[PDB]
Amino acid sequence: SGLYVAAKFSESTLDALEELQRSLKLPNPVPRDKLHTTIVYSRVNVPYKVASGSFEIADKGKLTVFETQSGNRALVLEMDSDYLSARHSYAKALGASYDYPDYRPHITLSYNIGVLNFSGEYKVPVVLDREYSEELD
């Protein structure tokens, strides 16, 4: 099948992301166990080696709406992360594909904000706990 890789976060990072969701009163918030950042979304599978260790990968981000393929207005925290961009480029160097114009690392915070709008720039220590790799439907 395809390949999906994402990063999961430390307990302190998850606490900060849930605080952001609660403080903004977001509808349809992503559950704590589901918070993540996609690295690889490839229709082809390659032997990507998940990372080992834990460390900070971003210290800030900006809110943006990323429409989903079903037409939902999802709200995300968009980051500039040398680490995540380098891991995406590692997957590409191994042969993975990414059928979108650009890779823009982000953490989805709400699945669907309806007609609402949200704007902001946030300081959040984003600490990688682990990466996971799995088959993509």
Residue numbers in the entry: 1 to 137
What does the paper say about this structure?
We next determined crystal structures of Acb1 to define the mechanism of anti-CBASS evasion. Structures of Acb1 from the Erwinia phage FBB1 in the apo state (1.1 Å) and in complex with 3′3′-cGAMP (1.2 Å) reveal that Acb1 adopts a compact 2H phosphoesterase fold with six central β-strands that form a U-shaped ligand-binding pocket. On substrate recognition, the flexible carboxy-terminal residues 145–152 form an ordered lid that closes over the top of the captured 3′3′-cGAMP ligand. Recombinant T4 Acb1 rapidly degrades the CBASS signals 3′3′-cGAMP, cUA and cAAA, but does not cleave cGG, demonstrating that Acb1 is responsible for the broad cyclic nucleotide hydrolysis activity observed in T4-infected cell lysate. The broad specificity of Acb1 allows evasion of diverse CBASS operons with a single gene, and the ability of Acb1 to cleave cyclic trinucleotide species suggests that this enzyme may also enable evasion of type III CRISPR systems that use cAAA signals.
